[PDB]
Symmetry: D5
Subunit: 195 residues, 10 copies
């Protein structure tokens, strides 16, 4: 039986720990992001394979999140010292190079267990991404098995859709992008859309 | 504390029930899909709002899954009788019209609870999608809060990536599509990619 | 063992939920009925067979209840959206047509379990009818297996008898209808009836 | 919480006891009735008010049940000796007179408690009636608060309905009597009834 | 393991219920007897064999108790309506005829069980008699198997003996009757009797 | 709560111990008496007051028991050495003198506690007497508070009544003595006695 | 496992009961002896064998205890009435004759069990003796199996030794008697004695 | 609550450990003494005050035990290395000097606790002596508070008494020594002694 | 409370995991070391401060262990990928450089908890060293708080002493080094060392 | 499982006991050492082998600790009396001679068990040494199997290292001694040491 504190439409489970932020160690906590959307994602291990490509994909596109009031934080079970060393490893060596996303350390595994992403037999997490709104409420959960990375395009579309539906109180159909048709969640009002 | 039987890299929890399949009631079970990938997704309620758009999006693109050895099954807590009535409601009335995807009924809520998608306060599920491989192993889990639909494009990309990595035993970086570069999961072999 | 909170001669178990009333979604509560008798009945499932005939029979004869200060509420495990769709289905198609009885939705199954009528293996209720007096006290319980409908005539006879015996403190013999002999519940007084 | 062993669609709870049958004490068992429908009914107390009218009502119309392969048995918490005294009491004194219906004695209360009809505060049953099919399965439960008697007509209508639906596998609409239209419990076949 | 609340030397267990007293139903309580001795006895069943002989033997000799400030109450598991019908049955038919002793009803079995005289296999009491003093303390317990009646003479003897020893603080030898020698309960004082 | 193993109509609780029999110490067991009725009685303490008079009353009339195939055994918590001293003490000093009834010693209190006659606050028994049949079944229980002794006449009457009803299968009315009428325990048969 | 409340150097377990003192029954308590040493001893049974010789041995030499401010109390499970009978029995018949030591009665066994001397299989005590100081602290425990009696000389020697070491704070060597050398309980001080 | 395994009449608790025996470490066991009486005694601590006097008093008188087929073993919580250093300390310094009695070491405290002589607040034993017969049954227990030594004379007296009563099946009066009168344990036989 | 499975003089707790050996990932097990002494030490974290100096000190002095049949294994909670990256970091940068000691990865924390060295609040181990003999038995445990490194010289001294005492069965005094005096563990033999 | 209260980085477990200090018995408490470092060490047994050499080693070099504000205390399960005897034993006989180090006694074993050094099978401690800082915090634990002594030099090196790191907040590399290079525990500042 799988156990987690992470529930959609409930407050995201609180976390705090040491992150590497612009080459320095800093205390970071979930509530530092109140007032903004947060994309909080776990990756298995520093110095491995799919993991740097995802951090780099989000990092290189960070201004696309920051301009819609959204922050990104990545997390693995490695220490902050390992995070720093990986950052100071050239991208060509499978390193990260300099990076604008905080890398949070979950050495005690408590944060992983709370978000239900810890693999007990391996001692690290799978690829779990969490979208948390400006009120600290968990809106979306995406978990991938180890071999397959996530999509920045898809995360962006999700954040946009949650902020849109937050604002207008209509609902976003399958595949919705900005500029797409939405639905009034009324059995009479829905007919606008379905005609 | 959230509880489920659904664990990535473990066998997907077994299910069986009545589905509507080409306008008829039929017994359907998870293991009927052994040997093929399965996209198994839950939606909140027949005769509601985001729900028909997702069923229709997958349904209208079904041959794109069937040609990569992948089936799709949708599920809600409504009865098979309600599923049939919704199918026999014109798309213009927010109905489904004829549909090639089985609609599985989870009236006892046991299947929802097993997949960890049941909302105890509402009596139906959230938007939870599950990708299960040809061996019955759970590979990917996507859960959306009620207001925001899923993406057929993204589901397809995920299925493709899991089947690719199944076959070649390399790993798929962030945003991977067919034709994209992969990584040899070796600290020496990974350097091919990172150069 | 079978369990229920519904005990004859004790206050009927409190319920509240969404009902379709006049084609609109309203909160409805058991306490809205204080001051009136209430026939509160569960039926298995919208869009089925015996179920429409029973709802229609009570609806079409509503005045016979209302003119003796009695209201009627029907309940299934279906959603309020499925209720509304059934109401908008013509009677020729097994729909209800417009209806003057509230259709209460018990989607979480709380109400059905409190009344002891929920079938664990099927995920819906059997045919359970409850007669609740104006003080909120449960007077009568009628439970039928699935294939056999209830009787509006028998329900009305029971309501009238509970009303007559509430008022006069005589008791009602077998088959009593308005205009029939009653019995004074005393070893001396009973002799007036039996001679 | 209210507890009982009696569940519709399951074997009626087994019982055995002393009954008065044609003036004599005999051991009577629920399994004596295999092969026949059984109307099994409890009444509060010998030498009381509604109770003799219900026993007489069923008694005088017994062949109406016996000619549709149905037996009737009555039960109260009173002793076999009290039952026999009551039989030997003239109808004109609230007595029973001779009757063809067995009066089963439930002095220990185990039968009452098994059928969920025992009133802990009072030490006797309410008016509970049970229709049990020829396979020993419970089909119908009718519980009345003390002041209001049951109906022979209605019991007869229900027995006929269960027998018809057993034999023809159609279902019986609200109010159904012999010669009334039934419904084919299929979404297509139902339309013959509804149209 | 046999259990009861009735202990010699301790307050007799409280009881209350409905008795037939001069043809009427009245609430009777143990505390109604404070200030008087009470012979409180159980008998198995109304309309049986030994039982009317005992009730009639104490009833017909009631003045032998009242003139020594002693009341008599009889109790069985039968309803008060059965007690009244028994009273209205002529002695020649095994009835009681009018009786001056209250007949307490113990339909719920609570009083029988508190007095340790309830027979779980039969659903009624054995023949248990209890002598309770004016202060409410249980002094004497006599329990007989079903086939053998008790003795009014022996009961009188015991009451007279307890009243004598209460008043004079001497003790009553085997077979003591009024006018008989008693013993000063003292290793010195006793010699007055034995010498 | 008062606890005991002694229950009417159930085998009398097994006992064994050392008794004084014709001035000698002997191993005695309840089962030694199988095949005959036994009057087994407890008295509080050797060298006390009511206690010798009861033992003497039975001892002096022992041939009245023996000639109806009934034995008598007395028991207290005192040791067998105390029993012997008391027997060797002249009747005029509250001693027993020679005696033909066994005096059983219950020094460990096990026998007293099994028979429910032990007084935890005093460390000895009250005056309890038991009538056990030839099959070892307990038929009668008489418990007196300390100040009041038992009756040999009443005990003989009970033994005679049990033996008579054992033999003829009729039952014995209140105050029955040898030569009195008995009752056939049958609703028709009983009318022989009452008419 | 053997259980007791009596522990050396801890307050002796409180006791109270009825003793025979100069031929009279009197309430005695352990606390009556505060301010003086007490030799408290149990013997198996009145009217037995080693038991009288021990009581007589102490009784005859009681002034040797009294003159060192020490009292003696004896106890068995026998009743106070047995104690008195035994005292009133001449020494030449194994009786005690007059005696100046209280004979405490432990009829309920509580005192024996508290002192750990009670023999569950026999229902009396072994030969146990306790030396309790003026403060109520248990100082010495001597337990003999049944066949072998205690020693007044040895008991006097112990009481004298406890009182001496209580007064001078030195300690008493093996076999110390009044007038023998004692030891200063100090690594240097001890050398006075040993050298 | 005081606990121990040592009960008079039952096999003495098994023990085994390392003893110093003639200057050497040897494994010693209780069963090594079968066929002989054993005086087994505990003393608090090596290098203390009363303790060497007791060990020396039994050692120096060992032939008084061996010539009646009795061995002596002393035990404390001290290590065997401490026992040996104590032995190699001259008597004049509070040492033992060479000794013919084994000194058992109970470093783990298990033996002390089995014998109920361990003092939890001090971490050593009180002065507890145990007389065990040739069959291994515990016959006698003597426990002294710390400040007061035991008596070799008393110990000899008890051994001689137990051996005499074992052989002759008579019992030993208070103060018995060899050559003293014993008692035939019989209410008749006893008169030979008392008369 | 602190818990561990590592007990001196008991078999060292089994472990197995992935190690970096010769720059490659290998399964390694405690049982691979049977036949050799093993120094098994935990260090807090790769890429830190005291940790490289200790690993380097043992690595650079490996021959001193291997020439006396002793191997060395280091362990932290870091992944094998972080170990490999640290090994590929030059010593001038706080890396290890190539290394001839296996670096075991304890990512699940199982091994660290089994050895009692895991710090719950920090998510890594303290400085814990374990010396395990050739039979797999744990001989020595050294635990240091974080800021203070261990000593290769002290470890080597300990290994040599355990080897010398395994071989000769003499014992090693404080500060013993090869060539120093040893002690024969006997009270007589020890005198050769101490004179 | 092995349990202990001693955890590095937490307050050393509190202790108190009798110690021998400069030839005398004194109560000694762990809190007596607040304000100073404390080397607290356990040794198996007085009058044994390695144990005196370790105490002498620390004893003779005491001022080396006392001049760096550090105290030393030794402890074994032996009594204060045995400790004093051992002190009074010439060094040439494996005795201690005078020593300035307190010898604390742990007769009850509570201190040993609290520090996790007690050997349940043997009844004494292994060789466990604990370095406790001036704030009462545990910094270092060294446990040796019985055959191998500890090192004064190494203990001294550790005390100096903890004192240096306390005061300067740098960290001490493997092998560090006074005058050796330390490390600044920061990823940038570390490079001064490593380069």
């Amino acid at each position: 039986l799988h156990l987690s504190k992470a529930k959609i439409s409930k407050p995201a489970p609180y976390w705090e720990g040491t992150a590497v932020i612009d080459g320095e160690f800093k205390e970071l906590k979930l509530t530092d992001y109140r007032g903004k959307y947060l994309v909080f994602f776990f990756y298995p291990l520093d110095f491995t394979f799919v993991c740097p490509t995802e951090i780099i994909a989000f990092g290189d596109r960070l201004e696309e999140f920051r301009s819609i009031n959204t922050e990104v934080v990545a997390c693995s079970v490695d220490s902050q010292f390992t995070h720093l060393a990986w950052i100071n490893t050239p991208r060509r060596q499978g390193g990260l190079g300099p990076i604008r996303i905080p890398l949070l350390s979950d050495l005690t595994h408590q944060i992983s267990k709370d978000y239900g992403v810890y693999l007990e037999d391996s001692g690290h997490t799978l690829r779990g991404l969490f979208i948390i709104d400006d009120k600290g409420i968990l809106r979306q959960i995406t978990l991938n098995d180890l071999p397959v990375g996530r999509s920045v395009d898809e995360t962006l579309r999700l954040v946009q859709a949650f902020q849109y539906t937050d604002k207008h109180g209509e609902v976003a159909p399958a595949g919705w992008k900005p500029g797409s048709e939405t639905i009034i969640p009324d059995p009479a009002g829905k007919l606008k859309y379905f005609d």
